Amino acid sequence: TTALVCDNGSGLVKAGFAGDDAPRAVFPSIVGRPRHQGVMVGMGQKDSYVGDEAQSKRGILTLKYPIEHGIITNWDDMEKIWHHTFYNELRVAPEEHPTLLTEAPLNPKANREKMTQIMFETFNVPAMYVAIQAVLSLYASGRTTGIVLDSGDGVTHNVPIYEGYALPHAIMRLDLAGRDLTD
Amino acid sequence: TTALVCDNGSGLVKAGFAGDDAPRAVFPSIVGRPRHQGVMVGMGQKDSYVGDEAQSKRGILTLKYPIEHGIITNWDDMEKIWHHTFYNELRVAPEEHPTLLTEAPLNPKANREKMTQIMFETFNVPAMYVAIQAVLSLYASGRTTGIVLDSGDGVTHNVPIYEGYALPHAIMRLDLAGRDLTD
Amino acid sequence: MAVFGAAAPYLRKSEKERLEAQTRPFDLKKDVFVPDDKQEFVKAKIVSREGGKVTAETEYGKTVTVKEDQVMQQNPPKFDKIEDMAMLTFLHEPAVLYNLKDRYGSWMIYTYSGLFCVTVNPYKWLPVYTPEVVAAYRGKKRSEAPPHIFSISDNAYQYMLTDRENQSILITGESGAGKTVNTKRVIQYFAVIALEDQIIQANPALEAFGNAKTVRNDNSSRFGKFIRIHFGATGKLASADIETYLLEKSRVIFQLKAERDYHIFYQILSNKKPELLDMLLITNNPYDYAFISQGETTVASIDDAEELMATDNAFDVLGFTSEEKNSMYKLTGAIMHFGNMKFKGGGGGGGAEPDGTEEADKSAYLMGLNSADLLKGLCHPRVKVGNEYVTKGQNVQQVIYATGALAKAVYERMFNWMVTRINATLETKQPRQYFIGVLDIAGFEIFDFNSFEQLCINFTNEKLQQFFNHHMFVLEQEEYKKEGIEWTFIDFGMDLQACIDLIEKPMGIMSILEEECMFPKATDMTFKAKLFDNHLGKSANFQKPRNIKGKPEAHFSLIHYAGIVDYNIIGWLQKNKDPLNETVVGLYQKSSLKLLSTLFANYGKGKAKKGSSFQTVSALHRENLNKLMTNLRSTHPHFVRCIIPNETKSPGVMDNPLVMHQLRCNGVLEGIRICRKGFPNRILYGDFRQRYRILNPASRKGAEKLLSSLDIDHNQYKFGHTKVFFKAGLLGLLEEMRDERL
């Protein structure tokens, strides 16, 4: 079999198969609901637009981000995002694909616990693992030492790694990110 | 055949084949252990860095000297030091090479006995001998009389020798040495 | 025997001569083999066994003494010159060597070895291959027909006609020892039984592009040539198909110090054609170029001038025109100039940019590409992420690896396209019914400086041997069920598969190397440490290396069917990587030259492919081997072994160590060892009666009564209904008591 690498991130979900040179699916992590009434009868509009499709109907939807700063705040929306990623984007059954997930440092333990519970129960993934953003970023850079500054849309954190050994007491986190810049 | 002249000392192991002008391998006598966990997988870090390698990884290791004041306090660490000296720095199998060891005057008898037992059992050297660090120094000076003051890193001592006859009742030992100066 | 004409002597000796040679002095007690220093063993007479000290007088007159624990009996006269090694009363490693030696002394070229066939190339013309023998041989079954290739060929033909299944022939031997002419005469035999000229005309293109000079052989072949000879519905020759497998790419870029590269480059540098040199702007000095100068510059292996001329003529008389030949020549020249590329790290940035461009300019002109576009692609590869394209950064090492991978890939595609063109030209419009396969592969080469390529070759040979062991076991079980004598059902595969599982399976040496080359900071010491941590003591085949006669270096040693083989880690990591560049392939597809055809394709359910960076030579090899085994296993196999008699050209003389090495690498010792653990000696009750009933002068009861009086233990024999099986010790005891009886 083959492993599946999904990165929820913040503001952009990116997923693909392991061993690939770039994620196959990249799309905003947005859940939209219609705020108007709807007069035409027979079209049968769906009650929730998820993913990049919500961008197309941006003008008649109330876009909501399931996560504020790394932490998931709307679990149902996150389940919808994961279902869309697994079915409508990769078109694969997670019943036979181990899943690698990415999670930022210094976060509530309940977050990881609920993530793993959802993955194991709702989708019945055979196995799964959770990793830190900084370690992966260092992996991709072809380096074994150095301090990595990861600044996404949710949170900006610095992690120093020396000879493959982390320095937990020196890890720094700051909530300033792209969303605050947009605001 | 040839004989190996190992001088454990304290804080600096120096060794080389007998008859050479100068010692072949000189390196600090420290054992380093990683005090962190390690995040990167697949590197396969060794659990103990011994010898000069530990000097290059000082920032992620805790260093322990196996010799406090002449005597050996951590026998596993000293065995690691001896193995590294025999198999890496010199790259010579001790199965067919007699060994000459040196130690300071007025040391516990258990130290010498255990050193001899380890050398005959673990490494199975054909033969070995033990000498005082002062008489060898007197030899190296091309003299046969006078007093010798051997101020190493662990212990200092004065040994008077006249016409090749040592005077045990006049040997003096003081525990002040380079380590105390560093402290 | 009169049917075999005047070739009868070589094919077999007359029964009268056999009887005449049977009687000669031999004392089984003290005529046993003795170890020797110059050779493994010598024929010598032991004066007596004085404790642990013995005195053996050999043919050379030496009186050396040997330890008593390594003495072993010798073949008696009545079983000398045996046709089949399976029937030898005492199965021993040098006994087969000496029997073959004395058989070639009498010029017995062909020998049975149970399931194997031993054929030593004669150095003089013989009448055995006269077509009259071929014409008059038809009508004889393998059992009665004495040893020769025609026997197994006819047996396989009969199987394909009657059992209605595909058959395959596997030939093993060193190139240049007569393999080519052996294949020629085999195909001639097939034609007689019903395109030999076409095959002969097309071979030069193949060995010209597939052979290179090594220490052992000056014309060593690497790729796994394979030929499927098809037949019609009525069992008549229809047409032939040709395929290639397991072509090595590492030889293109990396060469050992005392070895050359492929003959193509050296042949191209021949000065007898100045037009190609001047129109390709090729530097006439091989030293200047980087790819070739690393290895040995030149040897007196074969004169490249006339060989190149013959290859060009063969291409000219082939179906395609000269523009295509110019295309291959210019593409080979382009492959030659990729080594002149140089790159310098940017002063203010990590990315490295080129310094010189004249070589790049001329190369791009050659392929009809743009130098600026190629340099941008090499320096800044484009990659598709999601729905948008982004540029990736590359350092000097990565771009060098990419250039090497591109060169290797383009060469491989050229060779594959050439093979397809040759197959299309050879193809005739006859229907393709069941075929007969012919497989030629490199042997279990052994050096004192074994490396990654040798490891791959040895692994392939070990897999082939394991297949052979499984096939022989199946045949043995079939014979046992036919005879109703069925015991020891344990299969003979896992014993050799234990070493295989330490190579291809996850956590094996190959998998560990594949992972390690991915790690950004891998080094040889770390790789060795990981191997030692994961295999020393934990596996039953990984062990420490051994230092003998001042060998240059040894890192680790494996136990194979051919013995202990040590490999050198150094250099493996750098050459394992094969990272291809996608944008360069896209540019090639956009080119204005024929090259786009070879690179035409390269890299609702959502299957995932493999990243360019995640490309290693080791994996492809494995994949190729698998796609070969999934095919070769579909046909009934047959085995042919070719053994060189001596290093020198002088006929008759032999070098025992060379024969020992050939036997060890051919797996004959493995066959004899597998046979001896069971009951290799099987005799009919009629022969046993007429030869041994005089022992107890006086059929189930008679045989039981006779054997009960010989103090034969129950477990030393198997009592059957048609044949009776004996152990070697039983035969020796019977021989001794016959000798004392008479």
Ligand SMILES: Nc1ncnc2c1ncn2[C@@H]1O[C@H](COP(=O)(O)OP(=O)(O)O)[C@@H](O)[C@H]1O
């Ligand atoms: N070219 C650019 N210039 C400036 N900001 C950018 C650019 N591209 C992306 N961003 C910002 O980066 C954010 C995306 O961050 P992302 O990498 O998805 O974080 P995470 O990995 O945590 O999801 C967006 O909100 C956007 O504002």
Ligand SMILES: Nc1ncnc2c1ncn2[C@@H]1O[C@H](COP(=O)(O)OP(=O)(O)O)[C@@H](O)[C@H]1O
């Ligand atoms: N030039 C110097 N100045 C000051 N201290 C020195 C100098 N050279 C050596 N030392 C001290 O001597 C110590 C080494 O002592 P050494 O002769 O190795 O003792 P031993 O033989 O028992 O190992 C070191 O700790 C170092 O601080």
Ligand SMILES: [Mg+2]
């Ligand atoms: Mg992120």
Ligand SMILES: [Mg+2]
């Ligand atoms: Mg000292």
